[PDB]
C-alpha cells in the first residue's frame, strides 16, 4: 500500500526528519533493519571517523518540499505479509 | 510564515482547580504543536507535544486536545507546581515561532496597596539630576494606575515604572514609580504629587509634598 | 584520461572540447583512488 | 539522563563576534540532534537553528541567514556557534536543546541547556552609585515605614544587595534592574520596618558587585 501524502510530511520548506542510506558495503538481505551509521570507504586509501575524499556519510535526508513536483512528493508506504503453516490462523474474519 | 497567538494573555485560578488554555492559529495546522511551562528564571519544560500526546515524567493532570486550529490545554487539578508561564509551538512548517504567554496568578482577596513617596536625598541634589519614588506596597491584582501631578499638571514620557513580581507566600504584588528629572525641572516645579487609582480602592487617591 | 585531467590551457566553460574516445581498455582504479580529487561523483552508474 | 552543560555569562561589544558552546551528555549518539534556540529578556523566544549531530549539516533561521554559524566537535561531542555582527538589540539568553535520543530527529526541545547570559553593550565596567532612601515621620503608617539603598549607574548585572549582611530577612525587596538612555544599569531595594525602633537602631545595606570587585555599605539617615 502506498499513497501520497505532502499534506501531513512536507513541512513547508523542507522536511529533514527522513534519512535513508545510499552507501553500504554489501547489498541488503530481505527483511534485516541496519539502523548503525559509520563512514564509507571508496576504494583504497581508506577512512577512519574521518570525512572528504574517498569518505561519505550514510543517511542522506529528504528535502519534502511541498513546491516539489509530484515525481518528488513523499508517500507514506504500509506492506503487509500473510503466510500459511501448520499452526492455527488467529487472524481473519468469520471463523464460526 | 506560520501566525500564533494565544488567549487568554494572563488567567486567574486557585489551588485545586481547572484551567483551560487556547492556542490560536491563524492558518491551518495538522496537530502540529507542543505545550511549554515556564518557571520565572529557568530553562523550559514540555509536557504536551503533538497536541495531543502526554511526554513522560509528568503528572497526569495536563492533557492536550484539539486539532486543526483550536489548540486546548487542561489540567485537572491545581498544584503550586503549576503557577508558571505556558507556551504553545507550532511545528507544520517554516520558521517555528512560539506564543504570547499564558501565567495563572494566585487569586483571593484584592489586598489594597499602601501607598509611599519619597523625595530627593540632597546627594542626589547636588548630583546634578533629581529622583522622585511612588510606591505601591501589597496591591492586588498587579493591574494598577499610577500618575504623576507636578504643580497641579500631568507628566509624561519622563516617568518609569517597575513592578515587583508576586510573592510565593504573601501573594500580593508591589510597584515603585520613578520621575526622574534634571535639576533645572526641579526648582521651578515646587509641589510635587503622585496619584493612584486602583480596583481595591474606593476613590483615586493623591500623595504629595513641596520643597521639603 | 590524462589529457583530459591534466592540460597547461585547460579549456574555458563556453569552449568544451568534446572527445569521441572509443575502443580502448578504461581502468578507474587509480582514476577512483589518487586521493587527490577534491570532488568525485555521478549518476546512473555506481563508483564501483 | 541526559545532560546538557554549557559556558557562562559574556558581555561583548557592537560590531564584534562571540562563541558560545554547550556539552551534550548522550546514552546514545544517534544523530543526536543539536538545536539551538534564542530568548531576548522577558519576550518572545525567537529560534536559532539545528546543526546535524550526527554528520554536517547546518540548517539555519531566516532571520539571521548570512551571520550565524555553528558546528560541533565529535570526540569532545559539544556544539559550537557562532554568532556575528552584534548590536544592541542582541542582548539575549542563549539555549542549547535537542536530543531526540528516541527517533533520529525531531522539531521539539526536549532537553535544555540551563541557559547562557550574553549582553552586547557600549560601555565598560562601573562600580556602581548608591544612596540611602530615608523615610520621613509623616507617613508613620501602622508605626511602620519603608527605607531602601538606591543603586544608580553600574554596569554589569548583577548587583547582590542585603541589609546588615544577612542580619535583616523580614519584607526584603529587591527590584530587577531597568535600562537607562546612558546605557546604564540601576537598581533600587527596600524593605520596611516597624517605625517604634527607628531611630533606635542599626539598619545599613550591602551591595556587592564582583565584576568592579566594590563592596559598598552606607548607613541610612532618617
Same mark, same amino acid.
Given at each position: 500500500?502506498?499513497?501520497?501524502?505532502?499534506?501531513?510530511?512536507?513541512?513547508?520548506?523542507?522536511?529533514?526528519?527522513?534519512?535513508?542510506?545510499?552507501?553500504?558495503?554489501?547489498?541488503?538481505?530481505?527483511? *534485516?533493519?541496519?539502523?548503525?551509521? *559509520?563512514?564509507?570507504?571508496?576504494?583504497?586509501? $581508506?577512512?577512519?571517523?574521518? *570525512?572528504? /575524499?574517498?569518505?561519505?556519510?550514510?543517511?542522506?535526508?529528504?528535502?519534502?518540499?511541498?513546491?516539489?513536483?509530484?515525481?518528488?512528493? $513523499?508517500?507514506?508506504?504500509?506492506?503487509?505479509? /500473510? *503466510?500459511?503453516?501448520?499452526?492455527?490462523?488467529?487472524?481473519?474474519?468469520?471463523?464460526? | 510564515?506560520?501566525?500564533?497567538?494565544?488567549?487568554?494573555?494572563?488567567?486567574?485560578?486557585?489551588?485545586? @482547580?481547572?484551567?483551560?488554555?487556547?492556542?490560536?492559529?491563524?492558518?491551518?495546522?495538522?496537530?502540529?504543536?507542543?505545550?511549554?511551562?515556564?518557571?520565572?528564571?529557568?530553562?523550559?519544560?514540555?509536557?504536551?507535544? @503533538?497536541?495531543?500526546?502526554?511526554?513522560?515524567?509528568?503528572?497526569?493532570?495536563?492533557?492536550?486536545?484539539?486539532?486543526?486550529?483550536?489548540?486546548?490545554?487542561?489540567?485537572?487539578?491545581? &498544584?503550586?507546581?503549576?503557577?508558571?508561564?505556558?507556551?504553545?509551538?507550532?511545528?507544520?512548517?517554516?520558521?517555528?515561532?512560539?506564543?504570547?504567554?499564558?501565567?495563572?496568578?494566585?487569586?483571593?482577596?484584592?489586598?489594597?496597596?499602601?501607598?509611599?513617596?519619597?523625595?530627593?536625598?540632597?546627594?542626589?541634589?547636588?548630583?546634578?539630576?533629581?529622583?522622585?519614588?511612588?510606591?505601591?506596597?501589597?496591591?492586588?491584582?498587579?493591574?494598577?494606575?499610577?500618575?504623576?501631578?507636578?504643580?497641579?499638571?500631568? &507628566?509624561?514620557?519622563?516617568?518609569?515604572?517597575?513592578?515587583?513580581?508576586?510573592?510565593?507566600?504573601?501573594?500580593?504584588?508591589?510597584?515603585?514609580?520613578?520621575?526622574?528629572?534634571?535639576?533645572?525641572?526641579?526648582?521651578?516645579?515646587?509641589?510635587?504629587?503622585?496619584?493612584?487609582?486602583?480596583?481595591?480602592?474606593?476613590?483615586?487617591?493623591?500623595?504629595?509634598?513641596?520643597?521639603? | 584520461?590524462?589529457?583530459?585531467?591534466?592540460?597547461?590551457?585547460?579549456?574555458?566553460?563556453?569552449?568544451?572540447?568534446?572527445?569521441?574516445?572509443?575502443?580502448?581498455?578504461?581502468?578507474?582504479?587509480?582514476?577512483?583512488?589518487?586521493?587527490?580529487?577534491?570532488?568525485?561523483?555521478?549518476?546512473?552508474?555506481?563508483?564501483? | 539522563?541526559?545532560?546538557?552543560?554549557?559556558?557562562?555569562?559574556?558581555?561583548?561589544?557592537?560590531?564584534?563576534?562571540?562563541?558560545?558552546?554547550?556539552?551534550?551528555?548522550?546514552?546514545?549518539?544517534?544523530?543526536?540532534?543539536?538545536?539551538?534556540?534564542?530568548?531576548?529578556?522577558?519576550?518572545?523566544?525567537?529560534?536559532?537553528?539545528?546543526?546535524?549531530?550526527?554528520?554536517?549539516?547546518?540548517?539555519?533561521?531566516?532571520?539571521?541567514?548570512?551571520?550565524?554559524?555553528?558546528?560541533?566537535?565529535?570526540?569532545?561531542?559539544?556544539?559550537?556557534?557562532?554568532?556575528?555582527?552584534?548590536?544592541?538589540?542582541?542582548?539575549?539568553?542563549?539555549?542549547?536543546?535537542?536530543?531526540?535520543?528516541?527517533?533520529?530527529?525531531?522539531?521539539?526541545?526536549?532537553?535544555?541547556?540551563?541557559?547562557?547570559?550574553?549582553?552586547?553593550?557600549?560601555?565598560?565596567?562601573?562600580?556602581?552609585?548608591?544612596?540611602?532612601?530615608?523615610?520621613?515621620?509623616?507617613?508613620?503608617?501602622?508605626?511602620?515605614?519603608?527605607?531602601?539603598?538606591?543603586?544608580?549607574?553600574?554596569?554589569?548585572?548583577?548587583?547582590?544587595?542585603?541589609?546588615?549582611?544577612?542580619?535583616?530577612?523580614?519584607?526584603?525587596?529587591?527590584?530587577?534592574?531597568?535600562?537607562?538612555?546612558?546605557?546604564?544599569?540601576?537598581?533600587?531595594?527596600?524593605?520596611?520596618?516597624?517605625?517604634?525602633?527607628?531611630?533606635?537602631?542599626?539598619?545599613?545595606?550591602?551591595?556587592?558587585?564582583?565584576?568592579?570587585?566594590?563592596?559598598?555599605?552606607?548607613?541610612?539617615?532618617?
Amino acid at each position: 500500500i502506498a499513497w501520497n501524502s505532502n499534506n501531513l510530511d512536507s513541512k513547508v520548506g523542507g522536511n529533514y526528519n527522513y534519512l535513508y542510506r545510499l552507501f553500504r558495503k554489501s547489498n541488503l538481505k530481505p527483511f *534485516e533493519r541496519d539502523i548503525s551509521t *559509520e563512514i564509507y570507504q571508496a576504494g583504497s586509501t $581508506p577512512c577512519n571517523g574521518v *570525512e572528504g /575524499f574517498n569518505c561519505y556519510f550514510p543517511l542522506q535526508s529528504y528535502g519534502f518540499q511541498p513546491t516539489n513536483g509530484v515525481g518528488y512528493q $513523499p508517500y507514506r508506504v504500509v506492506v503487509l505479509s /500473510f *503466510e500459511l503453516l501448520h499452526a492455527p490462523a488467529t487472524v481473519c474474519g468469520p471463523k464460526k | 510564515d506560520i501566525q500564533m497567538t494565544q488567549s487568554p494573555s494572563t488567567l486567574s485560578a486557585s489551588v485545586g @482547580d481547572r484551567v483551560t488554555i487556547t492556542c490560536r492559529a491563524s492558518q491551518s495546522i495538522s496537530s502540529w504543536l507542543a505545550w511549554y511551562q515556564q518557571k520565572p528564571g529557568k530553562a523550559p519544560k514540555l509536557l504536551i507535544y @503533538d497536541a495531543s500526546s502526554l511526554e513522560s515524567g509528568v503528572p497526569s493532570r495536563f492533557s492536550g486536545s484539539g486539532s486543526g486550529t483550536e489548540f486546548t490545554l487542561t489540567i485537572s487539578s491545581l &498544584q503550586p507546581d503549576d503557577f508558571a508561564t505556558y507556551y504553545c509551538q507550532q511545528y507544520n512548517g517554516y520558521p517555528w515561532t512560539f506564543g504570547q504567554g499564558t501565567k495563572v496568578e494566585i487569586k483571593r482577596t484584592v489586598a489594597a496597596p499602601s501607598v509611599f513617596i519619597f523625595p530627593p536625598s540632597d546627594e542626589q541634589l547636588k548630583s546634578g539630576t533629581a529622583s522622585v519614588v511612588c510606591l505601591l506596597n501589597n496591591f492586588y491584582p498587579r493591574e494598577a494606575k499610577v500618575q504623576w501631578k507636578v504643580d497641579n499638571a500631568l &507628566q509624561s514620557g519622563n516617568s518609569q515604572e517597575s513592578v515587583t513580581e508576586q510573592d510565593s507566600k504573601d501573594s500580593t504584588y508591589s510597584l515603585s514609580s520613578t520621575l526622574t528629572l534634571s535639576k533645572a525641572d526641579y526648582e521651578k516645579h515646587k509641589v510635587y504629587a503622585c496619584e493612584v487609582t486602583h480596583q481595591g480602592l474606593s476613590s483615586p487617591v493623591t500623595k504629595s509634598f513641596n520643597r521639603g | 584520461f590524462g589529457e583530459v585531467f591534466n592540460a597547461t590551457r585547460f579549456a574555458s566553460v563556453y569552449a568544451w572540447n568534446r572527445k569521441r574516445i572509443s575502443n580502448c581498455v578504461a581502468d578507474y582504479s587509480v582514476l577512483y583512488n589518487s586521493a587527490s580529487f577534491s570532488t568525485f561523483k555521478c549518476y546512473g552508474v555506481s563508483p564501483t | 539522563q541526559v545532560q546538557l552543560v554549557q559556558s557562562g555569562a559574556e558581555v561583548k561589544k557592537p560590531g564584534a563576534s562571540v562563541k558560545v558552546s554547550c556539552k551534550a551528555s548522550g546514552y546514545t549518539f544517534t544523530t543526536y540532534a543539536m538545536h539551538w534556540v534564542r530568548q531576548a529578556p522577558g519576550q518572545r523566544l525567537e529560534w536559532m537553528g539545528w546543526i546535524n549531530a550526527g554528520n554536517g549539516n547546518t540548517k539555519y533561521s531566516q532571520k539571521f541567514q548570512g551571520r550565524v554559524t555553528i558546528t560541533r566537535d565529535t570526540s569532545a561531542s559539544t556544539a559550537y556557534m557562532e554568532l556575528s555582527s552584534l548590536r544592541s538589540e542582541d542582548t539575549a539568553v542563549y539555549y542549547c536543546a535537542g536530543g531526540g535520543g528516541r527517533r533520529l530527529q525531531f522539531d521539539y526541545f526536549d532537553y535544555w541547556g540551563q541557559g547562557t547570559l550574553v549582553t552586547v553593550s557600549s560601555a565598560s565596567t562601573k562600580g556602581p552609585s548608591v544612596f540611602p532612601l530615608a523615610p520621613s515621620s509623616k507617613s508613620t503608617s501602622g508605626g511602620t515605614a519603608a527605607l531602601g539603598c538606591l543603586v544608580k549607574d553600574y554596569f554589569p548585572e548583577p548587583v547582590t544587595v542585603s541589609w546588615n549582611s544577612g542580619a535583616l530577612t523580614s519584607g526584603v525587596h529587591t527590584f530587577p534592574a531597568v535600562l537607562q538612555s546612558s546605557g546604564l544599569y540601576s537598581l533600587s531595594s527596600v524593605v520596611t520596618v516597624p517605625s517604634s525602633s527607628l531611630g533606635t537602631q542599626t539598619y545599613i545595606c550591602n551591595v556587592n558587585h564582583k565584576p568592579s570587585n566594590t563592596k559598598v555599605d552606607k548607613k541610612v539617615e532618617p
